[PDB]
Amino acid sequence: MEAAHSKSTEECLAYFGVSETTGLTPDQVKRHLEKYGHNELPAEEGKSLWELVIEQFEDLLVRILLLAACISFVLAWFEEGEETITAFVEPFVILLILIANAIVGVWQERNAENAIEALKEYEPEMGKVYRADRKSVQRIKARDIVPGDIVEVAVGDKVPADIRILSIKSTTLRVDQSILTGESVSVIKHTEPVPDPRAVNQDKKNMLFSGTNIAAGKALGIVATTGVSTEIGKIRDQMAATEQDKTPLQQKLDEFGEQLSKVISLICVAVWLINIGHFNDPVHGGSWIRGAIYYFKIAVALAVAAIPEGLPAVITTCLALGTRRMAKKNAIVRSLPSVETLGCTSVICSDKTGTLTTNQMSVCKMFIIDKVDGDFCSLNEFSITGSTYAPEGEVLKNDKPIRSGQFDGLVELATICALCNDSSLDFNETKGVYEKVGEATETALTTLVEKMNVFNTEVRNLSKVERANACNSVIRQLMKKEFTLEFSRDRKSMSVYCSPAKSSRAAVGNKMFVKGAPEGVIDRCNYVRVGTTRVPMTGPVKEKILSVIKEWGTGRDTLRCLALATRDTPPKREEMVLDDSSRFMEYETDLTFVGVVGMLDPPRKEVMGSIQLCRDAGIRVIMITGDNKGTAIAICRRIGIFGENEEVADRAYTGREFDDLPLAEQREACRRACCFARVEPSHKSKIVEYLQSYDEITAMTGDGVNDAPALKKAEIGIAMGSGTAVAKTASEMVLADDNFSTIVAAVEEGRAIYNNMKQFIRYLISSNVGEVVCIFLTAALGLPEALIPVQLLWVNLVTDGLPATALGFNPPDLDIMDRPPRSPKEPLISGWLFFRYMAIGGYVGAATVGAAAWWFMYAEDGPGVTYHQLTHFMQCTEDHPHFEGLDCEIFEAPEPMTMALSVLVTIEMCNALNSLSENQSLMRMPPWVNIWLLGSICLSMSLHFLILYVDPLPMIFKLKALDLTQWLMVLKISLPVIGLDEILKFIARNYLEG
Ligand SMILES: Nc1ncnc2c1ncn2[C@@H]1O[C@H](COP(=O)(O)OP(=O)(O)CP(=O)(O)O)[C@@H](O)[C@H]1O
Numbered sequence: 001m002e003a004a005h006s007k008s009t010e011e012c013l014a015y016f017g018v019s020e021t022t023g024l025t026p027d028q029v030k031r032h033l034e035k036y037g038h039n040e041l042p043a044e045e046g047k048s049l050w051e052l053v054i055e056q057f058e059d060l061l062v063r064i065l066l067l068a069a070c071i072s073f074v075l076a077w078f079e080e081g082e083e084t085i086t087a088f089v090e091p092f093v094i095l096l097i098l099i100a101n102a103i104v105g106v107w108q109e110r111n112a113e114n115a116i117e118a119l120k121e122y123e124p125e126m127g128k129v130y131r132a133d134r135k136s137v138q139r140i141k142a143r144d145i146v147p148g149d150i151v152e153v154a155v156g157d158k159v160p161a162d163i164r165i166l167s168i169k170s171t172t173l174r175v176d177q178s179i180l181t182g183e184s185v186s187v188i189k190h191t192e193p194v195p196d197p198r199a200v201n202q203d204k205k206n207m208l209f210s211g212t213n214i215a216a217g218k219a220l221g222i223v224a225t226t227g228v229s230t231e232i233g234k235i236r237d238q239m240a241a242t243e244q245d246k247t248p249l250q251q252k253l254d255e256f257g258e259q260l261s262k263v264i265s266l267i268c269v270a271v272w273l274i275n276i277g278h279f280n281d282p283v284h285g286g287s288w289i290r291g292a293i294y295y296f297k298i299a300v301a302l303a304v305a306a307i308p309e310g311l312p313a314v315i316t317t318c319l320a321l322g323t324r325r326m327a328k329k330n331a332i333v334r335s336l337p338s339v340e341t342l343g344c345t346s347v348i349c350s351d352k353t354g355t356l357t358t359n360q361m362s363v364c365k366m367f368i369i370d371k372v373d374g375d376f377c378s379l380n381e382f383s384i385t386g387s388t389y390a391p392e393g394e395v396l397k398n399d400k401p402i403r404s405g406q407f408d409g410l411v412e413l414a415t416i417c418a419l420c421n422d423s424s425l426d427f428n429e430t431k432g433v434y435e436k437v438g439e440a441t442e443t444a445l446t447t448l449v450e451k452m453n454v455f456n457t458e459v460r461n462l463s464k465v466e467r468a469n470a471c472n473s474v475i476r477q478l479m480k481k482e483f484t485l486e487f488s489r490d491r492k493s494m495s496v497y498c499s500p501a502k503s504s505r506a507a508v509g510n511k512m513f514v515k516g517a518p519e520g521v522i523d524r525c526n527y528v529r530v531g532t533t534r535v536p537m538t539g540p541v542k543e544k545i546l547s548v549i550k551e552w553g554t555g556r557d558t559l560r561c562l563a564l565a566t567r568d569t570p571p572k573r574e575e576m577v578l579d580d581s582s583r584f585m586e587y588e589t590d591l592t593f594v595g596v597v598g599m600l601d602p603p604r605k606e607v608m609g610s611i612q613l614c615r616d617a618g619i620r621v622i623m624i625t626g627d628n629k630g631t632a633i634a635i636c637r638r639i640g641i642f643g644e645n646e647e648v649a650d651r652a653y654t655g656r657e658f659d660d661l662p663l664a665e666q667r668e669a670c671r672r673a674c675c676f677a678r679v680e681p682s683h684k685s686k687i688v689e690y691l692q693s694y695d696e697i698t699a700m701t702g703d704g705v706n707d708a709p710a711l712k713k714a715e716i717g718i719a720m721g722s723g724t725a726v727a728k729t730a731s732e733m734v735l736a737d738d739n740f741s742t743i744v745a746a747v748e749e750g751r752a753i754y755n756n757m758k759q760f761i762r763y764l765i766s767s768n769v770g771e772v773v774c775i776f777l778t779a780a781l782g783l784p785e786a787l788i789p790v791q792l793l794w795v796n797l798v799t800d801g802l803p804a805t806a807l808g809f810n811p812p813d814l815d816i817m818d819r820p821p822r823s824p825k826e827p828l829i830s831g832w833l834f835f836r837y838m839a840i841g842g843y844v845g846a847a848t849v850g851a852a853a854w855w856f857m858y859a860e861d862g863p864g865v866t867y868h869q870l871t872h873f874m875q876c877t878e879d880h881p882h883f884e885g886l887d888c889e890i891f892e893a894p895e896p897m898t899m900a901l902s903v904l905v906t907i908e909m910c911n912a913l914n915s916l917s918e919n920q921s922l923m924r925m926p927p928w929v930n931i932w933l934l935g936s937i938c939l940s941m942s943l944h945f946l947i948l949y950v951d952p953l954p955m956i957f958k959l960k961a962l963d964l965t966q967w968l969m970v971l972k973i974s975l976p977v978i979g980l981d982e983i984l985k986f987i988a989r990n991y992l993e994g
């Protein structure tokens with residue numbers, strides 16, 4: 001623990017007793033661990049309490065059913081309701097369905113949190129340190145960092161601990177501290193003390209805070225605090241729920257449920273008025289109150305029955321489920337809406353290097369000049385074996401291994417690769433593999449240098465740890481690096497200013513060593529080095545060099561290329577201003593060309609496939625990269641973005657060609673082109689923005705800081721697990737896998753969630769419309785009543801709970817990934833689907849009324865009132881308007897009513913079987929494609945049998961039905977509802993639209 005941004009850099013080193021360049025000793029690390037513990041927060045636990053989660057009773061349609069239960073609990077406390085205990089049952093036929101859905105949602109939520117926590121904890125965060133046991137920097141688990149050690153951070157990195165800055169290697173250091181300070185744009189740092197002890201974080205301009213991101217630059221620091229003492233460590237618990245709101249589709253279904261309240265309300269108030277007449281009837285003594293209280297109970301029960309009380313939970317669930325499924329594919333969802341949004345994406349923009357490609361670079365080819373004689377220019381080309389970062393391989397010329405030191409050009413070439421380089425190698429002792437520290441492109445040069453061994457340095461007798469940077473160090477010992485002009489994407493090159501080492505010859509000349517995109521670099525060369533010699537750049541020499549670059553980048557290896565140059569006579573340091581990055585290009589002029597290196601960088605295995613799937617799902621894939629256009633077009637071909645011969649003259653563009661276009665033309669180019677190359681970070685963002693101007697849902701995939709703006713602009717930003725912390729911070733999803741296949745899976749999951757939300761609604765609407773159609777069909781046709789308040793509450797508990805919820809576990813449709821993407825502003829409910837809600841709701845309305853009627857008429861066990869119903873119910877007591885007074889009251893027989901109640905349950909459970917797929921037949925999508933549904937159905941049917949046959953219960957709900965023959969008819973009236981939808985599905989299937 002050091003308490004000061006306010007002590008000097010010397011004082012900090014001395015406090016911890018550390019040598020700035022070596023780092024802590026093994027024993028020091030031992031002590032510091034003991035005294036300071038591991039660099040991690042304890043928390044890591046809790047989050048949502050079991051009870052906290054349970055409270056999604058907080059919704060809308062749930063509060064309605066909630067209150068409804070209150071009243072049925074209060075109407076019951078007044079000793080009445082119609083039948084004593086039957087009124088205390090009511091409040092529980094209501095809560096039960098709420099409790100069921102609550103349990104499911106809670107369970108889904110728990111499993112989700114878990115799966116995610118599993119995936120997040122999987123891959124250990126690493127840091128870079130200099131420690132006394134190793135000359136070059138090394139990577140260690142971030143939790144093993146202690147106060148006192150020398151840490152290295154560079155553009156892209158998450159700052160691993162609270163660090164006091166020692167040394168800024170770049171000309172500036174910019175940092176993203178939003179997570180801590182709310183400071184929206186990156187901020188500049190220095191290494192000078194900040195006197196004020198009580199200084200607020202924003203003024204700690206010589207400190208790097210754990211959890212912030214290096215936006216730009218490279219720095220060396222010493223760790224002040226770790227773990228909980230960390231600036232962001234103190235503030236973990238605090239903060240009043242920075243957790244946001246809900247998803248578009250969620251607010252949509254929500255809004256939709258909002259207006260269903262209105263309608264159901266009205267239909268209910270209606271039911272009350274429609275029946276304000278039967279208020280005096282003998283059934284409730286005709287009391288001038290007992291009649292309206294009953295029908296008010298009928299309306300309320302009809303309401304609780306009509307309201308899709310489960311809709312809120314099923315969204316929550318399908319969501320928690322998609323997150324869980326994605327977690328299983330090693331995708332981390334940082335933002336809930338991302339799966340649904342991905343669901344209707346029409347365009348996937350994608351970075352090339354490290355995203356479409358593995359970013360495992362190896363220098364496999366190189367050249368320098370050989371002869372220059374007038375229009376004749378010849379190169380010395382070489383090949384290099386070893387594909388990994390291991391310093392193991394050969395330099396081949398003409399199939400014979402050569403001693404690089406033999407060629408003065410290679411000596412210089414390796415010198416440049418070694419000095420103009422912000423990366424290094426670190427040998428992982430446990431994995432037994434050489435790993436990069438820093439950027440792949442640079443590390444590839446490091447391993448190259450080790451392979452070239454141009455000064456014939458003795459390395460055979462070195463450990464694998466030492467062997468990793470041995471020849472590079474040799475070069476470093478030979479030239480002092482005064483300073484570095486950081487790589488920048490406008491100039492697309494990078495520089496180092498160096499002086500001869502021992503200062504023994506303090507004027508044999510200073511040099512700058514330059515490396516960069518070949519086109520820019522070759523343009524700024526005026527000389528060409530030939531061995532130890534120098535001759536002027538000419539057309540022929542340049543054409544030669546460029547064409548071999550073209551050859552390599554377009555050939556079967558699709559080589560990523562770089563030019564290497566030296567500035568033989570650099571400006572005086574004093575004439576050089578380090579303040580403005582924009583003057584670096586001029587400093588990097590009048591160059592001598594030395595050579596080119598060509599890098600191998602294999603495409604990911606799963607990409608070509610994923611793209612085909614996008615193509616099938618109507619999804620466009622665009623490659624966007626800073627790399628040369630040649631290599632980018634070639635790669636696109638290799639992975640299927642472009643055909644192997646496809647003309648691409650106006651389907652591929654460099655940033656410059658794209659800028660040369662009018663705005664209108666740029667927008668258009670984005671609609672046809674699929675390869676954008678040598679484009680800056682601003683270009684990436686613009687392209688995405690253009691796609692969005694066609695009101696399209698755009699995804700962006702990337703890994704590097706040049707991608708963060710586009711990543712933030714897209715609808716869904718997807719970062720690679722292997723990429724920069726900056727790219728991850730700007731994303732909604734992270735592929736911890738680095739597996740590009742997952743993107744397509746996410747799309748499909750998001751497509752499936754929508755479809756499940758759909759069938760759920762279709763089931764509730766078409767069914768509940770039916771129930772309401774019943775109450776109005778009998779009351780209008782002038783029949784005995786079909787149902788009673790509690791009977792209503794029961795078809796509710798049994799047809800609107802788990803059978804509905806279960807549809808959320810529907811399997812994806814057969815063609816789900818073979819249609820195009822749904823426009824996001826598609827009316828939630830199609831014009832045709834509404835007719836389908838009615839055709840079904842109608843059969844349900846008229847099948848449940850026909851059942852009670854059939855009992856009164858065609859039913860043997862029942863009376864034989866025979867067609868016309870004898871017409872009315874004017875009889876009542878003993879023989880009234882005498883039209884065959886053979887039976888007294890019959891109506892008020894539980895039988896006709898229990899009958900309808902059982903066609904209702906049965907026929908609802910029947911057309912939930914229609915809700916496995918929008919338009920697919922039960923033929924291609926059989927009932928057993930969703931087992932969860934079949935279980936729920938059995939649960940309800942069986943629950944319905946209980947109520948009917950367990951002796952005390954039928955009294956509470958109204959007496960039973962002859963197993964043998966009654967059911968035969970219920971089942972005979974109900975089964976057709978499957979036949980009816982199956983005609984409807986066929987209609988919209990055999991004729992297709994949507
Ligand atoms: N460290 C470095 N020093 C010098 N030149 C570099 C460099 N890193 C990259 N370059 C060159 O600059 C060019 C532009 O880099 P930029 O980062 O925009 O793209 P990229 O091609 O490296 C990444 P991607 O394919 O994801 O877009 C690279 O293609 C390469 O030629």
Ligand SMILES: [Ca+2]
Nearest residue numbers: 304305307800
């Ligand atoms: Ca309901």
Ligand SMILES: [Ca+2]
Nearest residue numbers: 351353354704
């Ligand atoms: Ca990249």
Ligand SMILES: [Ca+2]
Nearest residue numbers: 795796799800
């Ligand atoms: Ca229902």
Ligand SMILES: [K+]
Nearest residue numbers: 711712714717
């Ligand atoms: K975004």
